[PDB]
Amino acid sequence: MASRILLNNGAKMPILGLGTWKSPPGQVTEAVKVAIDVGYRHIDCAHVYQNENEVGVAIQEKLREQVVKREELFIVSKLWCTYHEKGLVKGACQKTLSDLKLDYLDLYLIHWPTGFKPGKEFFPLDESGNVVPSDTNILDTWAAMEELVDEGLVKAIGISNFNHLQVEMILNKPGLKYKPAVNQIECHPYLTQEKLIQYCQSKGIVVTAYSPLGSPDRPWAKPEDPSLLEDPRIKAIAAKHNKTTAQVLIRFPMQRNLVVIPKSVTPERIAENFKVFDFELSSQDMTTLLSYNRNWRVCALLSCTSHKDYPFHEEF
Ligand SMILES: NC(=O)c1ccc[n+]([C@@H]2O[C@H](COP(=O)([O-])OP(=O)(O)OC[C@H]3O[C@@H](n4cnc5c(N)ncnc54)[C@H](OP(=O)(O)O)[C@@H]3O)[C@@H](O)[C@H]2O)c1
Ligand SMILES: CC1=Nc2c(-c3ccc(Cl)cc3)nc3ccc(F)cc3c2[C@@H](O)N1CC(=O)O
């Protein structure tokens, strides 16, 4: 298993990265330091995660320690929904760069296809709890992303949580300057994404799997919800390989030619999660894990189901 996948800009992206959603600012600096120490070279960030300064501290420290140089790192961030207006995109990118203490990003994603009213609140609500949309559209936001590449702020651009029709809208745009390099989507044994993966891979778009462990720390979880890490069937596959369930869950997308970004702030788990290059899931293991699909999403963006660009009405 080669550790990187080639993107459309000629750069190579590490297939295993560290996720940072819900990594509290008071804990994420150490997590990123440990991750770099044990070999992670790809960090998945976002402005909305409210912790980019603390990620940036860790990166700066490890650069000053001579542990890594910048060119060996693959830093991803994402344009939040309240910044989809063309005139806000550059400032949002530059805020992320300033917080991360970087002079470029390796990859910058449109975080969701839905634009929200601009302003200080990340999820602006009306008096009845509906998300307030903005008068923005995918193609104009994409054109603003393209400018970031032309100005050297970012090396590649991509999308996240786009359905195939939304991807196609960019691909077919008259005057397209850059194709999206990546679509980052939820993917795990309960939401296997067979059709959207087939679509993206056939169009030369690399897929990154988010919430590979089923996001047990997500803030809307219900106790009756399915739990991947506790699934006794996956535990049995893991035992057979002398690996943990988490390690099986990370290796699974790697063998589908996906990038995967498990999150932890716990040092032992950060190291555990990287130790996935020393075993192989069998054909039968892959087939069995795929067979657990239930089309079950942990990140369904439920406050946005009436937004014109809500991505999850389409089958894929
Ligand atoms: N583009 C998007 O819209 C989007 C949406 C969701 C996620 N993401 C990205 O994908 C990343 C990963 O997804 P996620 O954060 O939702 O969840 P996840 O990676 O599926 O699961 C993270 C949870 O699993 C725990 N954990 C980690 N390693 C473990 C292990 N070896 N054994 C047991 N438990 C373990 C973590 O606990 P501790 O941290 O306490 O150790 C945390 O509670 C995010 O952090 C973010 O970077 C992107
Ligand atoms: C899937 C997702 N949902 C939200 C939400 C959210 C919670 C519930 C609902 Cl119905 C919709 C969105 N809240 C967040 C609060 C703080 C923060 F830092 C991030 C919050 C996020 C967000 O970061 N997250 C992850 C993502 O979009 O990558």
**Sequence ranges of the domains in the chain:** 1-316
Return the H-helix or E-strand segment holding 57.
helix 52-64
With beta carbons less than 8 A apart as the criterion, state whether 104 and 153 touch. Answer: yes
Contact 26, 259 (CB under 8 A): no
β 12-14/206-210 pair status: unpaired
Report the alpha-carbon distance of residue 107 to residue 13 in Å, rounded.
9
> What are the structure tokens assigned to 75, written together?
């830093």
Resolution of the determined structure in angstroms stands at: 1.0
Nearest CA to 265 among 43, 28, 25, 26? 28
Ligand 2 pocket, CB under 6 A: 21, 46, 48-50, 111, 123, 219-220, 299, 301-303
Ligand 1 centre distance from Cα of residue 172 (Å): 33
Cα-based distances in Å from 213 to 38, 78, 273: 20, 21, 10
Cβ–Cβ < 8 Å for 76, 44? yes
Instruction: Tell which residue, 202, 216, 142, 198, has the closest CA to residue 174.
Output: 142
Which residue among 40, 49, 83, 108 is the active-site one? 49
Which protein residues touch ligand 1 with a CB less than 6 Å away? 19-22, 44, 111, 160-161, 184, 210-217, 229, 244, 246, 261-266, 269, 272-273, 299
SS3 146: helix
Q: Which strand ranges, in their side-by-side order, compose the sheet holding 18-19?
A: 18-19, 42-44, 74-79, 107-110, 157-160, 182-186, 206-210, 259-260
Distance between CA atoms of residues 273 and 17, nearest Å: 10
3-state secondary structure of 228: helix
Hey, which residues does 131 pair with through a beta bridge? 125
210 belongs to the catalytic site = no
Q: How far apart are CA 15 and CA 277, in angstroms?
A: 11
User: How far apart (Å, rounded) are the C-alpha atoms in residues 105 and 156?
Assistant: 8
Q: Evaluate whether 143 touches 314 at the Cβ level (below 8 Å).
A: no
The CA distance from 297 to 180, in Å, is 23
Distance 174 CA to ligand 1 centre (A): 37
d(CA 78, CA 208): 13
Q: Which long-range contacts (CB under 8 A, 24 or more apart) does 135-142 make?
A: 136/84, 136/85, 137/309, 138/110, 138/113, 138/162, 138/166, 138/169, 138/170, 138/309, 139/169, 139/170, 139/173, 140/86, 141/79, 141/84, 141/86, 141/89, 141/110, 141/115, 142/110, 142/170, 142/173, 142/180
CATH number of 1-316: 3.20.20.100
Please give the torsion angle defined by the CA atoms of residues 15, 316, 110 and 114, in that order, rounded to the nearest 10 degrees: -150
Q: Please tell me the distance between residue 116's alpha carbon and the centre of ligand 2 in angstroms.
A: 13
99 is in an annotated binding site: no
> How far apart are the C-alpha atoms of 14 and 159, rounded to whole Å?
17
